[PDB]
Nucleic acid binder design. Structure first.
Length: 194
DNA sequence: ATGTATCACTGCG
DNA sequence: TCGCAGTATACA
């Protein structure tokens, strides 16, 4: 959390680092796999180009009561905060100064689970606050495209910080990587509005 | 109403 | 194995 690779271009502003060492990350990830309860059924379908699909991964959301989060036809309410999530949130707040009330958690069982190209833009995502993507497990390729391409390997225990207006000009994705066979759990902390 | 973007898929090179 | 091309409802 002292060594940052800054990513900057017209409309792009992100920062990356390895926040947790190997041991602390293994301990956390081992806790996450036990505690996190992933959504199922209706709560795991999105609507895109006219059709519903199951997401090719698992999703959960946690955060303060009453906040919601919508994208692609689906509204999610947060389950309440569990210690391991509290612990990751607060250590992230500690290095960034920033503060968060909500966390989307995506789990990729292996390298065929993915997330398609999108922007993480939306009204309820508050002004003046970034998005913090933390990762545990397998290492997976993360790509920015400007509708030019920056490819970023997200390592075990890393933190990708995503400031304004990265989200109002560039698309991101976690493409299929067939050669990866291990799980990845990603956490993206946000500061949402009522 | 009526305009606009698409957090997903398959096909194929 | 990867990634470009071409894709009927929301929700605005």
């Amino acid at each position: 959390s002292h060594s940052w690779r800054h990513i900057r271009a017209e409309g792009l502003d992100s920062s990356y680092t390895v926040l947790f060492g190997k041991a602390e990350a293994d301990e956390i990830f081992q806790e996450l796999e036990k505690e996190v309860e992933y959504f199922t059924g209706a709560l795991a379908r999105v609507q895109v180009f006219g059709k519903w699909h199951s997401v090719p991964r698992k999703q959960a959301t946690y955060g303060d009561a009453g906040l919601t989060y919508t994208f692609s036809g689906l509204t999610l309410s947060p389950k309440p905060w569990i210690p391991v999530l509290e612990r990751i949130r607060d250590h992230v707040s500690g290095v960034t100064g920033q503060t968060f009330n909500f966390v989307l958690i995506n789990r990729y069982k292996d390298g065929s689970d993915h997330i398609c190209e999108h922007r993480d833009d939306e009204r309820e995502l508050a002004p003046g606050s970034p998005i913090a993507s933390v990762s545990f497990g397998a290492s997976r390729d993360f790509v920015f495209r400007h509708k030019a391409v920056v490819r970023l390997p997200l390592a075990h225990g890393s933190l990708l910080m995503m400031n304004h207006p990265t989200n109002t000009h560039w698309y991101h994705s976690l493409p299929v990587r067939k050669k990866v066979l291990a799980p990845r759990v990603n956490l993206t902390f946000r500061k949402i509005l009522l």
